[PDB]
């Protein structure tokens, strides 16, 4: 019944149903400043275009899950974007045209037989 | 061989001195435990269809 968070990630997916409130978007003490020392993923989550001050403020932080690497965990803003779609469609063209209604599910290329993780071909010799 | 195979099959005298062989075609080196095979005849069986769903991946 509450706004079901839905959004992708790089490996450890983050999402939960949420309700509106103050705008106290944190979990288990892990505020944006505790979980994201850097302001990059903090602000990406803030979704400056649509913040808790731009629209109905929300408190229920997207449940972490999969541990959550400090990089990819910022991907929950996809969850926010979908939550906003659940609110209304007015910013769906704003968010899609902005660049928030996409995929970003990229992981890593499979390790190949004779190569490394990052296809690091060895020092060949043409003689 | 045909004698050193029997010897390899020989159980007693310090089982660490015993030596695991393919037992299908005979192969000392590069023998996988569970299948117990030389990893060559394994390939032939892999193509034959003698496994319980051991297929080539396609990741």
């Amino acid at each position: 019944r509450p706004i079901q968070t839905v959004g992708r990630r790089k490996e450890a997916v983050v999402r939960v149903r949420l309700v509106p409130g103050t705008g106290k978007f944190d979990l288990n003490g892990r505020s944006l400043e505790d979980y994201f020392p850097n302001k990059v993923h903090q602000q990406l989550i803030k979704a400056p275009l649509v913040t808790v001050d731009r629209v109905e403020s929300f408190d229920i932080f997207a449940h972490l899950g999969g541990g959550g690497p400090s990089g990819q965990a910022g991907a929950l803003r996809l969850g926010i974007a979908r939550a906003l779609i659940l609110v209304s469609p007015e910013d769906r063209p704003a968010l899609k045209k902005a660049g928030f209604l996409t995929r970003d599910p990229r992981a890593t290329e499979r390790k190949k037989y004779g190569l490394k993780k990052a296809r690091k071909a060895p020092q060949y010799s043409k003689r | 061989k045909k004698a050193l195979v029997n010897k390899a099959a020989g159980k007693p005298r310090f089982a660490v001195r015993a030596y695991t062989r393919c037992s299908k075609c005979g192969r000392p080196r590069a023998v996988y435990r569970k299948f117990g095979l030389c990893r060559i005849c394994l390939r032939e069986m892999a193509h034959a269809g003698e496994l319980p769903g051991v297929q080539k991946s396609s990741w």
Binding site: - | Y32, V54, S57
Partner: protein, 99 residues
């Protein structure tokens, strides 16, 4: 009121699905109260090996033992149907062991 925990060890989603839903449905027909099928994670024991016989190459192949356990359910203690459960099982391809 559950007693019977099913465990099936297959390696073919199609086989375990098609055969389990029918034998389980017939167990229900005999009068047992049964929990719906439970899709469980899949298992794969992967192997990689050289193709060359003399083995003077880096050319490799990659196999995987696709062990499939899913739709593993639970049956309520209904002896008159448990007897049939014991007498009727699935092919060896699906290893039936029940608690």
């Amino acid at each position: 009121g559950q007693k019977i925990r099913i465990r099936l060890k297959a390696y073919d989603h199609e086989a375990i699905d098609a055969s389990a839903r029918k034998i389980v449905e017939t167990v229900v027909r005999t009068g047992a109260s049964v929990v719906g099928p439970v899709p469980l994670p899949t298992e794969k024991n992967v192997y990689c090996v050289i193709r060359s016989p003399h083995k003077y190459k880096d050319s490799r192949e990659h196999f995987e033992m696709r062990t499939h356990k899913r739709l593993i359910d639970i049956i309520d203690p209904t002896p008159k149907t448990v007897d049939a459960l014991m007498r009727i099982d699935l092919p060896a391809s699906v290893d039936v062991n029940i608690q």
